[PDB]
Design a protein around this ligand. Structure first.
Ligand code: ZQS
Length: 391
């Protein structure tokens, strides 16, 4: 396997809890900012005024190429909000395609619980489609601008690399967190074959899950439950989030598989860390989890399989110790399945917008042990898969 995108390999930093970010520049002369990669939204928005958690921000008055769109944007969401002022400017990705484009930028002037202290990022790059752009679908997303203005192919791919142990702010800064390959697929980043699932509709990166197993045991729910009210691939969410009913069934099964050790309710609620003596995390007592995805061929599916090394998220201990500690990174949702960063860390994920499909292959940087690895396997004969989609 040759790796043909060396300029873009290792261009990300960060971690599942705080997000993965890429360096970008905005304006003339270029202003460097670190930008969260978010496949779950569609706005390019950057800090544009002082904030306690920002060491730098976009200064529109210092950019000769700034254009004011004379329009505000207000983006409240469950956990937080940002608001700002729309404009356009020249934008580049230094460890990216060697192109500069004119793109929409939301200059964030006010926010609440958006910026994260010590995350090292100063804005967000929404890579999903115009339908979910704010204030409306007339605000062309960055990637749409990039493809229209250049010869960059209509595809990007993400290798998010979890360390398997905690990183502090300085360690994030010095460590490679993965790769965002703009316009292609780098074969060095994965092992085995790429398997593709259709993008059901171009808004979020929406997919259809057709079967779920815990250690090979079918969760045995009607497959519509798995996609109620949608299933998406979202680098801007930390956890694997499952619809309430599915979460309840999955947690019951995971508890049963891991029952040789009892964990407190707060662990299963994703709130409380668990710790083990250094090196002794009992990976083998925890089950693998397989999600079967609709394939491209009629009546065919494939599965992706993750380990506890994916769904147990490393965290630092609440007190000074050499223990290995984790939070359970599967949680309930009222807005559908979210395949967040902890599941993406298992895989190289190809966002093939041109062919309306998402590819999965085992990541060359997934965390595993000597006994088990993540997997992408197929095909399986699966009937009536369209019925798994929620309307
Ligand atoms: N993937 C996610 N991205 C957001 C993130 C905010 C901060 C980090 S990830 C931005 N967001 C959003 N929603 C609607 C329109 C625009 N953005 C929701 C929020 C949590 S989940």
């Amino acid at each position: 396997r040759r790796g043909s995108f060396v300029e873009m390999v290792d261009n990300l930093r960060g971690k599942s809890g705080q997000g993965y970010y890429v360096e970008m520049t905005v304006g003339s002369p270029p202003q460097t900012l670190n930008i969260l990669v978010d496949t779950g939204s569609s706005n390019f928005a950057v800090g544009a005024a002082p904030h306690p958690f920002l060491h730098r921000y976009y200064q529109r008055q210092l950019s000769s190429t700034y254009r004011d769109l004379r329009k505000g944007v207000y983006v409240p969401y469950t956990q937080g909000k940002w608001e700002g002022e729309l404009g356009t400017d020249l934008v580049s990705i230094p460890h990216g395609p060697n192109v500069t484009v004119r793109a929409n930028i939301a200059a964030i002037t006010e926010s609440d619980k958006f910026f994260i202290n010590g995350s090292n990022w100063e804005g967000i790059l929404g890579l999903a489609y115009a339908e979910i752009a704010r204030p409306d679908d007339s605000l062309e997303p960055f990637f749409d601008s990039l493809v229209k203005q250049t010869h960059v192919p209509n595809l990007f791919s993400l290798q998010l690399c979890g360390a398997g142990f905690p990183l502090n702010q300085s360690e994030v800064l010095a460590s490679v967190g993965g790769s965002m390959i703009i316009g292609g697929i780098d074969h060095s980043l994965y092992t085995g074959s790429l398997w593709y699932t259709p993008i059901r509709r171009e808004w979020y990166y929406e997919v259809i899950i057709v079967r779920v197993e815990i250690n090979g045991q079918d969760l045995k729910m009607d497959c519509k439950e798995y996609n109620y009210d949608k299933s998406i691939v979202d680098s801007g969410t930390t956890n694997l989030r499952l619809p309430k009913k599915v979460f309840e069934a999955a947690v019951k099964s995971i508890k049963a598989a891991s029952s040789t050790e009892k964990f407190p309710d707060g662990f299963w609620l994703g709130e409380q860390l668990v710790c083990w003596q250094a090196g002794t995390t009992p990976w083998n007592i925890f089950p693998v989890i397989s999600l079967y995805l609709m394939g491209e061929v009629t009546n065919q599916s494939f599965r992706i399989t993750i380990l506890p090394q994916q769904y147990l998220r490393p965290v630092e201990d609440v007190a000074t110790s050499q223990d290995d500690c984790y939070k359970f990174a599967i949680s309930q949702s009222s807005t559908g399945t979210v395949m967040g960063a902890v599941i993406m860390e298992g895989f190289y994920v190809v966002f093939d917008r041109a062919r309306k499909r998402i590819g999965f292959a085992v990541s060359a940087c997934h965390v595993h042990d000597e006994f088990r690895t993540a997997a992408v396997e197929g095909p399986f004969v699966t009937l009536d898969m369209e019925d798994c989609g929620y309307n």
